[PDB]
Design a protein around this ligand. Structure first.
Ligand code: 4TL
Ligand code: 4TL
Ligand code: 4TL
Ligand code: ZN
Ligand code: ZN
Ligand code: ZN
Ligand code: ZN
Ligand code: ZN
Ligand code: ZN
Lengths: 513, 518, 513
């Protein structure tokens, strides 16, 4: 660990992290729905739809072993409510044994197959009830059709949205039990503890992102990665400035010049006990705060107050490290990499127009100091290819233009290898973290031709900045299958005012399958 | 039919050139194994060097002239290299003691030239045709191209060679002269021969669309554009129908009509039809956005970078569809019925204009809340799409300069395609490949549909405020196709060639290939 | 003179090319009478057609090669036209069966070419040189140029031909001979080696300007100026912060407060060997990077990435120092001055509103930290006048408004003395570096009346910024002929993405004549 510098003694010197969450204490049981439902304790919620009849009435089919609840659930009562996606109702009542129970439903629409976005709305409705609930148990009865991956997604999302981050603070009570009624329960049981792992990986990423830039800086973040590595028995190595200078990472070092925090390059490694048959490098953009540099984020809508999230790529990679270190896949070697620094305004900062030299010898003309992500990634990519891996995948809050292309739901993936892109797309499908394949259009490459340097950092005209940024990155991968995931648009949940932890499950599914 | 005028100097028709100098070029194709005759004009060798970047020039073709062959020997040609786009001129006397001009264009070190690579080659060749009064060009192929690429070479050569001087008066090019003969030497020539006149057909459809787009909004208005479409239909003996305002009112096209309310030109709905003789296997509706000028309306294009002076381009989709109509009407495909549609109007600022906040009713009965008058294109398309589905077709493909956000997603080279049907989308991509007009599949993300939920109307026209506009606009259009395979091509970013300051006529070849191979 | 570094990869000197391939070109000038020989390389005829716009090409010169004469016959050349900048060139065998290239550049239909026309002609010529491997270029003048325009042709040819590759790393063959056919060749021969000197003075200035702000800083620029002085046997003196504090240069020192590089005042001196009959101070604005300071260049179109060019005035002066030091004019004493610093954002920077005191005791109210040029020039001008000189001429990238007045071609000249101004205009005509006289309007002076300080730095309303800035500078020259050349609009060739080196030949012609 390294000592993080302070301006005043009241400046924090570590990131507060919660490992043991109330979610981990929840005992989960899955029952088959064919046998009927037991309603004796806590809150019971039926997931109900009505195919064909848009906003049609609620109808409960499951038999329950309680006379009081059976009467409440009768068709004449339930038809007073409708299945409009996200709509919920729940009532408190006494059961046959005169114990207080709560019974309700969440509408799941009129389409039999729920998208991940549909399922998310269902969960949010459920969580709203939970945040006003003090009962010890929740039972969810699936009277809809979900596959194994979507059911795991249901649990992951439920766990993630339920949990509230109160680290920076100075009603309800977390349930101790979760019951689930679903068809062929036995096949869904193995998803439960996988969901719990995917949850924390995602929530851990969220904690790092949500942590403000005075708490989460290059030194405190690399410190956290070390502590994580030690807990998971991963090989770890933090490269300091002197080492970085020796490796000649001029692009990455240039970005951090104006920061009071020294650059820290995070390198964690998972190695399988058995034969190593595939080597992967995961690269996360790790800007702990993006002020923009001398190209300061002062334009309307530039949202400088959001830019603690510019290390979301790093967070996703570290979150994946947790999942991989916990699930311990076989026959694989994975490197978790992040060139961490802070982009600030100072007498010491790099300037627009500056020509800097990357670790592969390429000279780069800086057109915009706020395009700093690709500079750090450039040296990180050179570092990764030197490891001699089969796949290189980077993930980064790289370009604001993603907001105008795919939006806030789908991340974009670019690459030099169709097979690798396909694996990512497949991983997106099974993780239910949506990604869309975007092209690297070679005709735009000429725009990066610098008059004085080997290459330009940005275009002056093209405006297709996400593609141009990909073209720049491609110049630092010489002979390895490489993919690039731009999560600038999808990383932050603007409506809920919190991170998503996007990427963790996607990257984990990628290495596992 | 009568174009309204403000003053007598206002034009009442779009000047259109049908018989171009390109059509006067006699094209001959010879097989390269017979040897090349170098007699006159300019003879250009298309040469590459596989694996050797900036490799030396070597003329592998048999040249049927002792003097020219001597000139083109490897020893003499070594000094020149094949760097993609590079070119050289040679001057010499042939065996008949006549002075002849010879040269080459470098095609690089790749074995397969891409879309952009070949256009680079053609542009280099065109520079050799400009500022040189030549009567004949001979092109010798020493690179390998498939039939579609050979056709693409000719189409692009014709299109770039052609110079549009319709609006020139005192500044016509005094030295403008076109070759009268084109010679082509290539391996297995008989295979490529049929591609020649197809290329000339593809050239004009593209150039015709280009003429309509380039034509300024005072020349090209809803009345004169619909008048041009009738003249085209009459020339091709296609069925044609133009729907006037009273007919449009009967069909209750409130979305389309509201957009044109502020204009001095009455709305004109174009409906051309190609009908194959015999069994019709496929019925297709092609829909083009036909905004002759987009001021933005009361949401005026006044913001920095909004490029209001470009907005004559906003009927590029309609132009593409009409260009396709020329190609289809000329090549006469079998087993198909094609409907060429465009809801044409002008988006202007007036006492009569539609307002931000207005609730209008589309022809399928859905009420629409206008949040931005500058999103007028999807409004006209909405009624056009409803009209299209009433025709009972198998495929509906619309093409439109719809969202500026395409510049930020795919840029100026690739068009975006959206749709409700994977098979149709795949056919569009296939047509993209064979036409060499690049298109990329983009998603219609259903999670964003909620943002189009209106407090008062059935649906919001736009925004508040997803930012992924191209997708939101596609979601809106989807609401007006109920049960028909539909695809949407946003060409807002690729329609105009900013570098050359001219239209591309994008989509004509794409749509034609779609029709011809479906 | 030790350049401070943030990281070990930060450059500590400006790379400079002194020996260029241009200097290895052997120039021969022949009279057009007696005919032209075409034996090898590329031969280009400069042709116009006064009778017809875009008229046919017609070669008038007798060529002593029959094969080439056949090529140049009227029937062949009339297929080509003389539109300015249009060119064609063909490869062929001459009488000796040696490969030669012969062509032309269109020179339009106006008998007398302007400097803008001639530059277009040269650019067409250079395109051919860059695209052909040639040991020799021959140019045949079938147009009319005077001695100054001919030199300009050579200077421009040399400058545009030369390619700056100092910052190229890892992402050939110049001509060795130049032949010129022209009527009355003997009167043009003496322009050749003068042109070569003017070329490098201009190219040397270009090298300094093009060099990014991380390479070119106040310390390395002053170091570079010393190296130049040593090679030319000029007296030199670099004033450091202690000395500047002693000289009370508060305006100059305030600007550099926020930089990591100490202020460095450059003072080079050329003195003729004989009696000194004229003393001249040339003053160049030397801002190595202009971020704008706390008035950050953040507005759209402010082009902060261009701002390495803000020492262009200094570079022109140093480039002039090369030419003067090489050509060694008689009975003159020339001082080359530049108050070099960097305008940055820091805890240490000067603020908007700060009241500072120039070396002549005048207190100045800073209204805008991005108007820093006039503040550095203020102390530089006071320094210059104390040298007891006859003329003071400053050259500076001072005001962006120049783009709106004269544009990108003509610099503006302001002054307090009509004789000096007319001399500069005369030097503009002979150097072919276009300048236009603009007024110092005394009615605007009242806008600089500060409420608290002696004077305002900027006007709060009078949008005539170039004139207002001239009024400010005028306050720091008390009793000396002074002129001010604003090159903010002309210094950078935006189309070619490179500096012009504007001002070197202008200032040198001023000293020489
Ligand atoms: C426009 C340039 C090329 C400067 C760019 O993409 N900059 C990105 C950047 O700063 N990289 O280090 C960038 C990244 C994200 C965002 C962004 C801004 C918002 F207001 C958002 F809500 C968001 F999700 C992303 C904007 C610019
Ligand atoms: C921002 C909204 C959603 C209103 C939009 O996309 N409007 C488009 C429109 O006016 N439809 O009728 C629109 C279409 C094209 C462009 C556009 C602007 C430019 F400066 C270009 F260079 C260009 F190619 C397209 C901008 C907005
Ligand atoms: C508007 C003020 C008075 C602050 C001003 O002229 N500032 C100049 C300055 O920064 N002095 O230190 C200034 C100088 C040059 C430019 C300038 C900007 C561009 F984008 C150009 F392309 C250019 F040629 C000059 C703009 C402002
Ligand atoms: Zn940034
Ligand atoms: Zn960033
Ligand atoms: Zn519009
Ligand atoms: Zn429009
Ligand atoms: Zn400034
Ligand atoms: Zn300045």
């Amino acid at each position: 660990a390294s000592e993080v510098p302070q301006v005043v003694s009241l400046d924090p010197t570590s990131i507060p992290i919660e490992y043991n969450t109330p979610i981990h204490d929840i005992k989960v049981q899955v029952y088959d729905i064919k046998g009927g439902c037991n309603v004796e304790e806590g809150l019971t919620i039926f997931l109900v739809n009505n195919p064909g009849k848009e906003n049609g009435p609620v109808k409960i089919s499951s038999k329950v072993n309680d006379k009081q609840v059976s009467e409440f659930l009768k068709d004449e009562n339930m038809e007073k409510f409708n299945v409009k996606l996200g709509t919920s109702k729940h009532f408190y009542m006494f059961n046959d044994n005169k114990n207080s129970v709560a019974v309700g439903y969440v509408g799941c629409g009129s389409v039999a197959d729920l998208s991940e976005a549909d399922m998310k709305r269902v969960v949010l409705s459920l969580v709203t009830m939970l945040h006003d609930n003090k009962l010890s148990k929740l039972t969810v009865v699936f009277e809809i059709n979900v596959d194994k991956n979507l059911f795991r997604f249901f649990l992951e999302t439920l766990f993630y949205e339920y949990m509230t981050d109160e680290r920076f603070k100075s009603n309800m009570e977390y349930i101790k039990h979760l019951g689930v009624y679903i068809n062929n329960a036995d096949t869904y049981k193995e998803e439960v503890e996988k969901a719990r792992v995917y949850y924390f990986g995602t929530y851990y990423a969220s904690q790092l992102i949500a942590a403000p830039s005075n708490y989460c800086n290059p030194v405190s973040l690399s410190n956290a990665a070390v502590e994580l590595a030690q807990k998971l028995n991963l090989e770890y190595k933090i490269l300091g400035v002197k080492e970085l200078e020796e490796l000649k990472m001029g692009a990455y070092l240039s970005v951090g010049k104006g920061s009071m925090y020294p650059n820290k390059f995070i390198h964690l490694t998972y190695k399988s006990k058995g034969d190593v048959k595939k080597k992967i490098a995961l690269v996360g953009k790790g800007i702990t705060f993006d002020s923009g540099g001398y190209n300061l984020k002062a334009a309307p809508g530039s949202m400088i107050d959001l830019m603690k999230f510019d290390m979301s790529g790093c967070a996703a990679v570290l979150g994946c490290a947790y999942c991989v270190g916990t699930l311990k896949p076989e026959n694989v070697e994975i490197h978790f990499l992040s060139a961490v620094c802070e982009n600030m305004v100072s007498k010491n900062s790099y300037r627009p127009g500056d020509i800097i030299t990357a670790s592969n010898g390429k000279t780069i003309e800086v057109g915009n100091t706020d395009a700093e992500g690709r500079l750090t990634l450039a040296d990180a990519l050179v570092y990764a290819e030197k490891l001699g891996v089969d796949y290189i995948v980077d993930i980064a809050t790289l370009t604001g233009a993603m907001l105008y292309s795919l939006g806030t739901s789908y991340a974009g993936v670019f690459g030099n290898n169709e097979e690798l892109i396909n694996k990512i797309l497949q991983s997106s499908k099974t993780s239910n973290e949506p990604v869309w394949w975007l092209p690297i259009i070679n005709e735009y490459r000429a725009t990066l031709n610098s008059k004085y340097a080997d290459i330009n950092q940005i275009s002056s005209s093209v405006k297709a900045s996400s593609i141009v940024a990909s073209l720049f990155l491609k110049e630092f991968v010489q002979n390895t299958a490489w993919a690039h995931i731009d999560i600038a648009g999808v990383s932050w949940n603007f409506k809920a005012r919190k991170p998503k932890g996007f990427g963790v499950r996607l990257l984990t599914e990628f290495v596992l399958n």
